[PDB]
Each structure stands twice: as C-alpha cells, then as structure tokens.
Amino acid sequence: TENKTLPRSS
Amino acid sequence: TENKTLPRSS
Amino acid sequence: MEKTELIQKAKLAEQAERYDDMATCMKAVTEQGAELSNEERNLLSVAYKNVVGGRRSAWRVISSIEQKTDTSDKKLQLIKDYREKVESELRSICTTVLELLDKYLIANATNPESKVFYLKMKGDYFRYLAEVACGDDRKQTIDNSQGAYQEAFDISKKEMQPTHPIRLGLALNFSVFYYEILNNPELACTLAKTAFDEAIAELDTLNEDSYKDSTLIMQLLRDNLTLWTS
Amino acid sequence: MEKTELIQKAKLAEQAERYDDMATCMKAVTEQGAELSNEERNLLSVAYKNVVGGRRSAWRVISSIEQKTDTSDKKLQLIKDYREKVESELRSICTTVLELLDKYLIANATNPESKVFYLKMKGDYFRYLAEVACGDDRKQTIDNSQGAYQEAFDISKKEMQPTHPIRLGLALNFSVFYYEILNNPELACTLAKTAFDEAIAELDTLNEDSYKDSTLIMQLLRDNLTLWTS
Ligand SMILES: [Mg+2]
C-alpha cells in the first residue's frame, strides 16, 4: 500500500 | 470483452 | 555484451517493467547466434509482447475514436495521422520480431518444442500485422499468419502431448486467429474445444506442477469458448 | 503545430496512454508562452506524472534488488549501472519540468490558482528528485521541495476555499512529503486531517463541477490517514 498523491499515473 | 491470447501483456 | 549479462539485464528490465530495454537485451542475445533456452525464449516472448501490446492498445483506442468521429469533422485528419503513427510503430516491432524469427530462431531450432514456439510466435506477429492491414496487404499477412500457425499445429500434434503448455497456447492463439482475423467462430470454437477436450483426457498423467501450468491455459480456452458461445 | 491541435493531440495521446507524446505536446504548448487554462494545466500535469512515474517505479524495483544483492556479487555492478541509468532518466524528466515551471509557468501566472498549482508541481518534482538523492544533495533538494510546497500552501490558505481541488491536492501531496521525505508521521497526519476537516465543514457549498474532483481528493486524504493510523 503506497501513499496516494496526485495526479495518479495510469 | 476480449479474446485471451498468450503471453498476455502485464 | 555477454549473453549472461544480457539475460541478467533482461530479467532486471522485466521486473522494472522496462520492456523496451528487455526487448533490446533479448534481441542482442538472439543475435549472438546460439539457440535460446526455455527461459531465454520466454524472456524474448514476454519482452516483445509487452512492447507491441502497448501499440495494439493505443491503436485500438485511437481507432475507436476515429470510427465514432463525424466524417466531416476537420479534427478527424489529426486522429488519422496519429493512428498511422501508431501503425508505423507496430509494423516496425512486428517486422523486427519476424526478422529475428526468420534469420535465427526458426532456422537454428533443434527440437520440436522450440520450433512450435517460434512458429506460433510468427503467426502471432503476422496476426498483429493483419489486425491493422488493408487490401491485399491484409490478405498476404493473413496467409502468412495462417501458414505459420498451421505448421506449428502439425508439429505440435505429431511431437507433443495435448497437455503441453506450448501446444495449448498454440491452440489458444490459433483459435483466436480464426475468430477475429478470419471471422469463423465455428472453426475457432472447434479448435479450442478439441484442444481442451484432448487435454482433460490426459490430465491424469501430470504432477501438480505441469497440471497447474496446463490447467491455467485450459481455463483461458474455456473462457474464450464461453465468450464465443453467447 | 498550433495550440488547438496540440491540445487535441495531447488528449488523444492520453486516451491512448502514450504519455511521452502527450508530454511533448504539452511542453510545446508551454513553450509557446501563453498562460495555461485549468484544462491545459491538468494535461501538462498528467502527462509528466505518467512519464516520471514509470521511472520512479522502475527505480524502486531496481534499488530494492540492488540492496538485496551481496556486495561481493560481480553482477552488482550491472544492477548499479542500470539503477543509475533509470535515475539519470528520472533526473532529466524532473529537470525538464522544473525548467518549464521556472522559465514559463510560474513566471507568467496571473492568478493565485495557477501559481499554487505550479508551485505544487515544483514541490512534487523536487520531491521525486529527493527520493533518489543522497547526502547534502538530498538535504538541499528536500529544502527546495518544502519551500515550493510551503509557498503554495500559504497562497492557497490566503486565496482559496478549503474545498478547492488545487488546495486539496496540495494538502495531499504536501502531507505525503511530510510522511515519506521528512519522516514526520504526526505532522503529516495533522496536515492531511486539517485540510480534510476544513473541506468537510464547507462541502455543502461546493459547486457540482468540483464535487467529483474535490471528493476524489478527499477520498485520497482519508485513505492516507487510514493507512498512517493503522
Ligand atoms: Mg507516493
């Protein structure tokens, strides 16, 4: 589980 | 849906 | 480079999902002029499948947008030029793969397992070319794909067992070739169904390792069958 | 090519997941010298995020393999050289972006929204450089990332409602900077939680065009909080 950032790579 | 073929791209 | 180092780098690229690097490595290996092991043969297959797969996916998306674009929309030309750029890249990759199969892999194959695998690969990449071809070009690429698949099919039925993963994979991609390229669902189903049934008959003769390998592909066969019979 | 067609092509490339082409289009738009709209800024952001993300993931995989490799093993050098290659590609992408940000975008921004967006991007790409830096270089890169984030954070607190997607995205990425780069989980949680709470207190007044974006970011803020507190 990674920390979520934006934008997100597809 | 799509037709399964091997090998399949990740 | 050294073959041992090229293969290490290729396994590293695979892990990092750097399939361009991975393909470049395995092309260098193939150019060393020696027969590939089962491991190296699988590395070459995975690498170029991922490299071409990105272009097949892009081509599909762009083609879908083009189709639903009004023929009089002045923005359609740009969509068409971009689709052609993707096609050009896809043809370059397939040509590179078929060239490798023609000048090294098929020529120097010294066992039926490898010969079936490489001919299967030759049909696969003529099939990818046919997916985007038109006119007589499409006819010849389809003929070449069919020819390769057919020789792989004869050899696999003569030299290998119905549960061998390579033979089941050949049946899988060859059936798809009949369904999508030749638009013959009846023959596609017969081919996949025949390979599937001939496999379950001899599932008795396998340890849980080969049983796992074969059963995994047979599930893909029955998935296509379920999809096609609806 | 003209801006209208560049945007057109960039959206095509996005749909086709050809982010190299996409970033090339948005770099050309940027270098034309005109201020970017909200749509164009997000296209620039998405393009280079996918371009750099592939290198970040590759670098992590290869670095993890390097660290599991015995220092005596002779194949370690091949792994290290490969890591440095990907690292060099990553630094080149980050440098290109930071050069665009300082040369064109931040310089010509006429509204606080644009300035906060670009300063957030600056913190992001200094942060990506910090992930792969060591020693004093790492410290200075961390300072540059924090400085950009902090400036955008003050401008957003002074000029934007807590529900604005740009202010929320800034909180999300800045809190992650606190958690992964500064290694301060308590301040990261407080930063994310504060932005989350301030947005909830105002959610009822949000515009329906920003529901989907603001709420999406709020979902991510909450997911990070749930992970960091468990
Ligand atoms: Mg992260």
Numbering used by the authors:
A (entry chain D), B (entry chain C): 356 to 365
C (entry chain A), D (entry chain B): 1 to 230
Please give the exact wording used by the authors of the publication that reports this structure:
In the inactive state, the SH3 domain binds intramolecularly to the CRIB-PR domain, resulting in a compact, closed conformation. Here, we show that phosphorylation of two pairs of sites within this region triggers the binding of 14-3-3 to IRSp53, which inhibits membrane binding and the interactions of Cdc42 with the CRIB-PR domain and cytoskeletal effectors with the SH3 domain. In all the structures, the phosphate group on the phosphorylated side chain engages a cluster of basic residues in 14-3-3θ, consisting of K49, R56, and R127, and additionally forms a hydrogen bond with the hydroxyl group of Y128.
Therefore, to study the binding of 14-3-3θ to the pT340/pT360 and pT340/pS366 pairs, we determined five crystal structures, allowing for direct comparisons of the structures of singly- vs. doubly-phosphorylated complexes. All the singly-phosphorylated peptides, except Site 1 (pS325), bound 14-3-3θ with ~1:1 stoichiometry (i.e., two peptides per 14-3-3θ dimer) and relatively low affinities (Kd ranging from 5.5 to 16.5 μM). For the singly-phosphorylated peptides, the electron density is symmetric for the two pockets of 14-3-3θ, even when two-fold symmetry was not imposed during refinement. Specifically, the Site 2 and Site 3 peptides contain a proline residue at the second position after the phosphorylation site, producing a characteristic 90° bend of the polypeptide chain, which as a result exits the 14-3-3-binding groove, thus leaving a significant portion of the groove unoccupied. Although the sequences surrounding pT340 and pT360 are closely related to each other, they are distinguishable by the presence of two large side chains in the Site 1 peptide, Y337, and R344, occupied by smaller side chains in the Site 2 peptide, E357, and S365, respectively. A previous report linked IRSp53 phosphorylation at T340 and T360 to the binding of 14-3-336.
